[PDB]
Design a binder for this molecule. Structure first.
Ligand SMILES: *[C@@H]1O[C@H](CO)[C@@H](O[C@@H]2O[C@H](CO)[C@@H](O)[C@H](O)[C@H]2NC(C)=O)[C@H](O)[C@H]1NC(C)=O
Ligand SMILES: *[C@@H]1O[C@H](CO)[C@@H](O)[C@H](O)[C@H]1NC(C)=O
Ligand SMILES: *[C@@H]1O[C@H](CO)[C@@H](O)[C@H](O)[C@H]1NC(C)=O
Ligand SMILES: *[C@@H]1O[C@H](CO)[C@@H](O)[C@H](O)[C@H]1NC(C)=O
Ligand SMILES: *[C@@H]1O[C@H](CO)[C@@H](O)[C@H](O)[C@H]1NC(C)=O
Ligand SMILES: *[C@@H]1O[C@H](CO)[C@@H](O)[C@H](O)[C@H]1NC(C)=O
Ligand SMILES: *[C@@H]1O[C@H](CO)[C@@H](O)[C@H](O)[C@H]1NC(C)=O
Ligand SMILES: *[C@@H]1O[C@H](CO)[C@@H](O)[C@H](O)[C@H]1NC(C)=O
Ligand SMILES: *[C@@H]1O[C@H](CO)[C@@H](O)[C@H](O)[C@H]1NC(C)=O
Ligand SMILES: *[C@@H]1O[C@H](CO)[C@@H](O)[C@H](O)[C@H]1NC(C)=O
Ligand SMILES: *[C@@H]1O[C@H](CO)[C@@H](O)[C@H](O)[C@H]1NC(C)=O
Ligand SMILES: [Ca+2]
Ligand SMILES: [Ca+2]
Lengths: 1082, 167, 83
């Protein structure tokens, strides 16, 4: 009980723990940090006690008794040894130095004052005295030991654990002549401890009256036997009881899995300027804030983490990006913002540290100009002058490898230096002298320049892979990953060299931690706090600018925020993204859609209600297919179509904002359906079903009451229809091969399509006629989606990985315009704006479905040139009032489907359902219908042994299943008698054909059958027929009382699952599933 | 030539006019220069990924993998365009097949057949040089071949290789 | 090199003659070079207690040349002109 955490951070691979019960202290060793460390037993204050000449410390033991005050540890690095020290580290000695190779674990015997030590290469257990001058062997030259790890003692017994044998062993601690196994099949036993009062003897505590402020450590030093110690980052005072806190700067080093603190005195080799960060992955960059003593780093995917230099707080602080991992960090300490770099999204972004609610936006993204970000790798900021600097590898689309400058709100862009920058690492800024430093790995140089783009020069030569840079005072510090070195030089000339650390693998970038104060560096956002609603960003001249988070826009007051209402939404297989039509606005117009299960193919929008709908496809995972809607602010996410999707998935989404309807194309292997679903309801209908045609991309026009679709199957075409598909016309039948994209213009009455197999963009008028071409050539190789807005068409190209805008009139030959560049796996684009979705009656030509769904109960359809609505039923049939729905009184089919009963019509071209689908307990296998009471009788399987019978009523209003014979065997066969009002059933589990009365009152058994399945009855001739699929499968005839029995068919039957009788012809039909054939007889 | 060559595709030579043509994909350009390292210029703009180049007669032919196209232009100015094939996936480089004859292009190795023992390689000024296969060295007569007897042998996990101490 | 021991062996070229000249567990002979002009056999050990050692062509004598300032000696060359 009472599981609680002592150390929350700074541990990498703890080999051994010791606890000092007198001093209320805890000690531990670490292999990777190569350290022995001490802290209060609650973990509050920690210190590094031994770091010199420590390589692989594995074992640790203590004697805290008054006058002993001694600790022992083992090292299995080169020159393996066992060492003794004072519990404060003030005295150090080596006590076992020979006949030792892989010394694993240590234990102490307090009455005898002996040290017990164990070796895994020479395979022994030995004991010696505290000075190592008496030595003896307990177990030696014995094959019992294979790979011992840990050791404990109790009375005259010694216990240990072995990793080779996966075993825990007991022996006699003096000669080993008695041996036993405590455990036999442990996964791997690493550590062992023995618990009894005798293992922690009592003794006086010197520290009980001491006044040390942070740590009091037992000491072997006469007369007071204690000493005061300070934590990491602290100093000790000449009073020798108090500690002070070092304000001096220190250096932060980043490594693939660790972050370290180093001291700017190169002769101090201990890495203890701060508690290390010991659990990172893919470390590249780090930032710090001194006003709260925090260190910040990035964690995949899209998360930022912060920790305090004392280890006291460690948390995941904000999500950075839904689209990919961030790489580079910069911090503004005046406005309290963190700028970061996202290469996969090709963006530079800002996040707010102030307040309880996180806000973030995108400042710069790839827009096809050379000035935008191509592939950014390093970022620096100047808050006082409101400037941002970054290093970029460029892109093949046109962004050069460069050092670039901007204003901290993104409103200006400049290229300062380019050329001879093939492999370009981070950029750093000297703010006092206003000079930028960067590193070119392809030439092994560190280069310097002015912030205005002048005076480029080389400062350091002959490097191999300079990964990290930082400038502080008169000195420049850099790290090299091939030389495995951290070095310091003088920034004026680079003419002196000092080496801080060497042989460091997996080096990464460096920072320097110092007291940078906001009062001196103050700017507009610091001078005008609480000005902006969401984000404040400085700009040159002491001025400030207000910024609004993703999905929101800034309002003409310059301080307030309001959602976007005019943007374009683009689909790509991994995501859905929104962009502003203002080419200078690099912000995200909507919170992106990204994550597990997203394989988006099409997106549509409902502007009035503020929703975006999209479809997802997967050939290997059923649940990953469907239609889903979200809001541009990411608030509410829901699934609208998940049931009944074909193998080829949904390949179309159109939304009718007037009627509140959604149209989609559902593609099976050998056929396709066009379906409609009423939003916020469980109403779904099939409007078209076709096999030789292949409707794929669908768009809807409620203003002119038309529904258009594009088909790129065999005999490709573009078609027009009504909102219920009751009319079909073909607009384009020639010069069309792979039409994949369909857009409609309300202002001109034109529909636009793109074909990537002809490399063409074209328009045709909805009434038909000639066809016009808008863009054509070797260019425009793979246009996949198109939309129309104003005097412009906006389309997406897969090969060029670009989003283009051009003028929608044929004959224009101006070069296109680019909105975003380097977007992978593109799919179509649509637009979100009130103009494209009018809701006024005068603008919608008085559509009847605009108000209260036209009064139709289920579905409302507005047909052309009709002043009244037309109504459709998702289930049932439509009545004389023309607006309500009721269940059919004609003749139809009923069939069971797992947990439900469903209805079907004899006419294949009728897509009405006679009644809504009914849900029942278990799995239903039986159907018979009673014409007097208008009810259905069915049989249910509840488990592999238990069955049930039930009846449900059709026309007596709404009804639910009612149960008969709540306990029978697995039953699948039912027949009803209309002359006697009796029920007959086929009990498989109990090998019997049974009869029952309509009310469930009276029960009888008619026959015993090996494997009975089906029953047929003729009451006006007193005969019964059934089928048996047991060995010697047969069809048998009997009398309704069972008094005669004869086989009618006993040849060429294997699995006669179905039986039927036709009284118009007096013919008996049966079906066999093994012979796979249907036969008829008399 | 160097500089502004981040993504550099094949190089081809016009032998009659002695001019080198190359393509820079990072800028979408076909560039031309003299064989002596002078008169660099851009001849074709606005390409996407020019993968293949060939020059024949008055015409320059190139293939683009993103436009999925093979196109012909006039090598003097690039001011006329003809399209040979389109919608071709996975395009790669092009050559032109024609009757290039040795009699006109003769050199030292053609004029002195059977001179070298193993390999003959031309050099400027009509002269020829003799070359010897891997593992062998050339002998002071300038024509014969004999095994190396002074070299350093280096080991790497995938291979063992030998290098001459003559840099 | 085995898991817990190492052998130094000699084989006569173009013959099926093979002999073991040294077998050691706590030392880790790895890189070996030979000098027939001065009749010495040198090796480098980068195990625990790393060292460089000299011996005879049958390993019947052993001496340590470098025992300090040596951690991971992986490479051994001999010069006939300077010794
Ligand atoms: C379907 O239900 C949603 C709510 O789940 C309705 O959305 C609301 O629409 C009104 C009017 O535009 C907005 O003021 C609300 O903010 C919306 N709610 C939410 C949670 O965003 C929607 O109108 C309904 N109808 C359709 C066709 O979607
Ligand atoms: C560390 O080892 C070196 C070499 O044996 C020795 O000179 C030095 O005194 C040792 N220092 C400590 C603190 O053990
Ligand atoms: C240890 O083993 C010996 C031999 O079986 C036996 O005589 C002795 O009693 C054992 N000791 C204990 C404590 O069981
Ligand atoms: C802390 O100690 C270091 C020497 O180890 C010294 O350089 C520094 O100035 C001290 N700082 C304070 C605040 O005492
Ligand atoms: C984390 O920080 C908060 C606020 O300063 C503090 O109350 C809390 O104690 C910290 N966590 C730990 C484990 O100390
Ligand atoms: C919309 O999302 C909010 C959370 O942001 C939730 O509280 C609310 O209930 C949601 N609205 C509906 C209708 O589900
Ligand atoms: C439906 O289409 C036919 C052609 O198939 C056309 O003649 C008819 O006019 C259309 N319906 C209406 C109401 O125009
Ligand atoms: C099928 O019916 C069983 C029993 O009613 C139910 O548990 C299961 O979820 C159903 N599965 C499907 C795919 O309908
Ligand atoms: C069927 O159940 C009845 C009633 O428990 C029992 O008498 C009969 O023996 C069972 N028969 C079979 C074949 O399980
Ligand atoms: C098969 O059925 C016929 C007709 O009822 C009968 O005469 C014959 O004996 C049956 N044979 C077998 C093997 O059951
Ligand atoms: C062999 O080594 C010993 C030292 O171990 C040395 O005294 C002796 O001289 C050596 N043998 C010869 C023949 O020199
Ligand atoms: Ca062992
Ligand atoms: Ca194409």
């Amino acid at each position: 009980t009472d599981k609680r955490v002592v150390h929350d951070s700074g541990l990498s691979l703890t080999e051994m723990i010791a606890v000092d019960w007198i001093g209320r202290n805890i000690y531990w060793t670490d292999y990777t940090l190569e350290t022995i460390e001490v802290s209060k037993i609650d973990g509050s204050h920690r210190t590094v006690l031994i770091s010199k000449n420590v390589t692989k410390p594995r074992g640790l033991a203590l004697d805290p008794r008054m006058g002993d005050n001694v600790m022992f540890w083992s090292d299995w690095g080169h020159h393996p040894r066992i060492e003794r020290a004072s519990m404060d580290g003030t005295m150090r000695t080596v006590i076992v130095q020979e006949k030792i190779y892989w010394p694993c674990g240590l234990s102490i015997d307090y009455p005898n004052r002996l040290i017990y030590f164990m070796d895994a290469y020479l395979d022994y257990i030995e004991f010696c005295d505290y000075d190592g001058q008496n030595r003896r062997q307990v177990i030696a030259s014995d094959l019992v030991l294979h790979h011992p790890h840990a050791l404990t003692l109790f009375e005259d017994s010694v216990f240990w654990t072995d990793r080779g044998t996966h075993q825990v062993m007991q022996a006699n601690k003096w000669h080993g002549r008695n041996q036993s196994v405590v455990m036999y099949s442990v996964p791997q036993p690493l550590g062992i401890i023995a618990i009894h009062p005798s293992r922690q003897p009592s003794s006086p505590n010197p520290c009980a009256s001491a006044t040390c402020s942070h740590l009091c450590l037992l000491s072997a030093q006469e007369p007071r036997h204690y000493s005061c110690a300070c934590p990491s980052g602290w100093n000790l005072s000449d009073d020798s009881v108090n500690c002070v806190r070092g304000d001096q700067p220190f250096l932060i080093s980043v490594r693939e899995n660790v972050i370290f603190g180093i001291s700017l005195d190169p002769e101090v080799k201990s890495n203890d300027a701060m508690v290390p960060i010991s659990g990172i992955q893919h470390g590249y960059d780090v930032e710090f804030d001194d006003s709260e003593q925090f260190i910040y780093w990035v964690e995949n995917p899209g998360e930022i983490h912060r920790v305090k230099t004392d280890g006291s707080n460690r948390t995941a602080f904000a999500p950075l990006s839904l689209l990919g991992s961030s790489l580079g960090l910069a911090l503004d300490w005046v406005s309290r913002n963190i700028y970061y770099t996202t290469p996969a999204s090709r963006s530079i972004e800002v996040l707010t540290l102030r307040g309880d609610t996180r806000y973030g936006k995108t400042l710069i993204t790839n827009d096809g100009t050379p000035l935008g970000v191509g592939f950014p790798v390093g970022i620096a900021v100047d808050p006082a002058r409101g400037k941002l600097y970054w290093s970029d590898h460029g892109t093949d689309s046109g962004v050069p490898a460069k050092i670039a400058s901007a204003n901290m709100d993104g409103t200006s862009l400049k290229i300062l230096f380019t050329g001879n920058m093939e492999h370009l690492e981070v950029v750093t800024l000297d703010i006092q002298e206003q000079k930028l430093y960067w590193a070119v790995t392809s030439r092994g140089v560190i280069e310097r320049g002015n912030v205005d783009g002048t005076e480029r020069m080389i400062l350091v030569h002959h490097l191999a892979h300079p990964w990290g840079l930082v400038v502080h005072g008169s000195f420049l510090y850099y790290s090299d990953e091939q030389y495995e070195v951290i070095e310091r030089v003088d920034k004026s000339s680079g003419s002196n060299k000092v080496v801080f650390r060497d042989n460091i693998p997996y080096l990464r970038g460096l920072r320097v931690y110092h007291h940078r104060n906001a009062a001196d560096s103050s700017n507009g956002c610091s001078n005008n706090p609480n000005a902006c609603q969401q984000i404040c960003l400085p700009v040159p001249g002491g001025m400030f600018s207000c910024a609004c988070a993703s999905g929101f826009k800034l309002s003409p007051d310059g301080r307030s925020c309001s959602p976007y209402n005019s943007f374009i939404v683009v689909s790509m297989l991994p995501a859905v993204r929104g962009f502003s039509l203002e080419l200078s606005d690099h912000s995200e117009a909507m919170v992106p859609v990204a994550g597990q299960g997203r394989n988006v193919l099409h997106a549509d929008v409902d502007v009035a209600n503020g929703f975006i709908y999209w479809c997802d496809f997967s050939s290997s995972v059923r649940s990953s297919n469907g239609i889903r809607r979200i809001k541009p602010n990411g608030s509410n996410f829901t699934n609208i179509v998940t049931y009944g999707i074909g193998a080829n998935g949904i390949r179309g989404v159109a939304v009718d904002w007037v009627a509140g309807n959604l149209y989609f194309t559902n593609a099976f292997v050998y056929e396709t359906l066009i379906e409609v679903i009423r939003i916020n309801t469980t109403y779904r209908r099939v409007l078209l079903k076709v096999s030789v045609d292949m409707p794929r991309h669908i768009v809807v026009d409620p203003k002119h009451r038309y529904l258009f679709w594009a088909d790129y199957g065999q005999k490709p075409k573009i078609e027009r229809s009504f909102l219920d598909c009751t009319n079909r016309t073909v607009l384009v039948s020639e010069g069309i091969v792979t039409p994949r994209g369909l857009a409609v213009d309300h202002d001109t009455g034109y529909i636009y399509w793109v074909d990537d197999s002809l490399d063409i963009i074209a328009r045709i008028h909805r009434d038909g006629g000639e066809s016009q071409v808008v863009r054509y050539g070797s260019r425009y190789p793979t246009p996949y989606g198109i939309t129309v807005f104003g005097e412009s068409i906006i389309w997406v190209d897969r090969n060029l990985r670009k989003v283009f805008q051009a003028s929608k009139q044929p004959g224009n030959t101006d070069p296109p315009t680019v909105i975003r560049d380097s977007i992978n796996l593109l799919r179509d684009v649509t637009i979100f704006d009130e103009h494209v979705q009018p809701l006024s009656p005068a603008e919608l030509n008085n559509n009847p479905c605009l108000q209260s769904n036209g009064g139709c109960s289920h579905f409302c359809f507005a047909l052309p040139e009709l002043p009244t609505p037309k109504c459709g039923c998702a289930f049932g049939t439509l009545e004389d009032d023309g607006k309500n729905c009721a269940t059919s009184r004609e003749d139809f089919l009923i069939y069971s489907l797992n947990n439900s009963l469903r209805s079907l019509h004899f006419d294949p071209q009728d897509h009405n359902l006679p009644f809504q689908a009914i849900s029942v307990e278990g799995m239903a296998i039986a159907l018979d219908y009673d014409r007097r009471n208008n009810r259905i009788f069915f049989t249910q399987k509840l488990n592999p042994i238990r069955g049930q019978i039930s009846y449900v009523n059709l026309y007596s209003g709404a009804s639910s299943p009612t149960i008969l014979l709540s306990n029978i065997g697995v039953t699948d066969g039912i027949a009803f008698d209309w002359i006697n009002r009796r029920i007959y059933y086929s009990d498989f589990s109990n090998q019997t054909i049974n009869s029952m009365a309509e009310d469930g009152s009276n029960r009888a058994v008619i026959a015993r059958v090996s494997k009975p399945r089906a029953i047929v009855l003729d009451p006006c001739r007193g005969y019964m027929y059934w089928t048996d699929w047991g060995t010697n499968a047969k069809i048998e005839r009997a009398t309704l009382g069972g008094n005669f029995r004869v086989p009618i068919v006993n040849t060429s039957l294997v699995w006669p699952n179905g039986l039927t009788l036709d009284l118009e012809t007096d013919l008996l039909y049966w079906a066999d599933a093994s012979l796979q054939k249907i036969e008829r007889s008399t």
